[PDB]
């Protein structure tokens, strides 16, 4: 029956709104000097004119990922490739062949737009793709 008395305060609700998360990934803020302290750089504008295009991830990172299977098969994967993937395969082969001293073994997945490379070249490929403007 008897219940504690209370007051309805709308003014303080603004603090509650601070606590609500966003579903949408925010767009990176504009910086005066690139790259940022963490090393991030936005994609070039306008897009580089090439036969292929490498889209950024939803987090605005370059989609180059290390992959391993069987505990020993180190591989590098380039995802979100659009356009002529075969043109990217030749460009990657010319770029990596000096470092290895041989033509790199690769697999082109035209359906998924994925280039798979044997060995770890994620760091080198990320910088290489950043220069192109992707």
């Amino acid at each position: 029956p008897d219940y504690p008395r209370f007051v309805e305060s709308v003014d303080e609700y603004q603090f509650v709104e601070r606590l609500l998360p966003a579903t949408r990934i925010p767009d990176p803020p504009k910086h005066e000097h690139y790259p940022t302290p963490s090393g991030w750089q936005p994609p070039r504008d306008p897009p580089p004119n090439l036969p292929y295009f490498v889209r950024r991830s939803r987090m605005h990172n370059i989609p180059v990922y290390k992959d391993i299977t069987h505990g020993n098969r180190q591989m590098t994967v380039i995802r979100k490739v659009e356009g002529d993937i075969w043109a990217l395969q030749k460009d990657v082969e010319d770029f990596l062949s000096p470092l290895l001293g041989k033509t790199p073994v690769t697999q082109v997945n035209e359906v998924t737009g994925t280039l798979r490379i044997k060995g770890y070249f994620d760091q080198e490929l990320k910088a290489w793709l950043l220069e192109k403007g992707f």
Partner: protein, 269 residues
């Protein structure tokens, strides 16, 4: 140049895609094969039995765990706009920006700030964590930021990390408990920037870090963001601007505060 547009161009010639011409990707299906106690060695003492018992995992479920947040990760989150340095950074903002994942049911007690990436850390932030290393604190202070270590209990940590699920329960905001006796020394020590530590000692501790690591302690009082930098929550406050005992009504966008004397005394105690 055309790879996506070429595939769609080929589609125009081919027959209409339908339920009659679909197939799984080659390699996604292994063909089924049709025919058409463990740890027992057969009599001897098993290997896993003949090894002596040792307390490797004794009390594992009661050990405290802290998710590591590095300065590299923190700087990366700030660079991409997922954590805003212009406001106090706490567990809620870190979780909301997907910077860290906290599992209270797995004995997580918060985030521990780690020194990895201190050399390149440039952001000026006001950040509340549960544990911080000496080097991590120095990196934040050297940039004019403020770092404080605060304790959240399992119930409080669950609420702070996921506020909206709590508000939907319909319970009044509880007051977070004090740290256990063992932790009390850590959180009452200025060297750790403890939230329960004496504010007067802080200047001395802050200067000692500047001397040891060879940087000039900046004067945040002169900073434009000083008011935000010194913003801190009461030891009993889970959320900024929200007191214990308040009930959040998200449907009507209202907050209900109790006026009963006994209730007010309990929540403020």
């Amino acid at each position: 140049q055309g790879g996506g547009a070429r595939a769609l161009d080929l589609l125009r010639g081919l027959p209409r895609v339908s339920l009659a011409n679909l197939k799984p990707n080659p390699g996604s299906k292994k063909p089924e094969r049709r025919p058409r106690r463990l740890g027992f060695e057969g009599g001897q003492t098993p290997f896993y039995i003949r090894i002596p018992k040792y307390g490797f995992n004794e009390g594992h479920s009661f050990r405290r765990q802290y998710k590591p947040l590095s300065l590299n990760r923190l700087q990366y989150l700030i660079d991409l706009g997922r954590v805003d340095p212009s406001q106090p950074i706490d567990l809620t903002q870190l979780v909301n920006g997907r910077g860290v994942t906290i599992q209270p049911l797995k004995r997580d007690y918060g985030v521990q700030l780690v020194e990895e990436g201190a050399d390149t850390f440039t952001a000026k932030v006001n950040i509340e964590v549960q544990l911080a290393s000496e080097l991590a604190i120095a990196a934040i202070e050297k940039n004019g930021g403020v770092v404080t270590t605060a304790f959240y209990d399992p119930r409080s940590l669950d609420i702070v990390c996921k506020p909206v699920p709590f508000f939907l329960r319909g319970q009044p905001i509880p007051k977070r408990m004090l740290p256990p006796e063992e932790l009390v020394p850590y959180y009452t020590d200025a060297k750790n920037r403890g939230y329960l530590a004496d504010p007067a000692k802080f200047p001395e501790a802050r200067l000692e870090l500047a001397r040891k690591y060879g940087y000039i302690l900046p004067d945040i009082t002169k900073d434009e963001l000083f008011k935000m930098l010194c913003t801190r929550k009461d030891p009993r406050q889970i959320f900024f601007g929200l007191a214990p005992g308040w009930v959040v009504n998200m449907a009507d966008k209202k907050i209900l505060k109790p006026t009963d004397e006994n209730l007010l005394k309990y929540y403020t105690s």
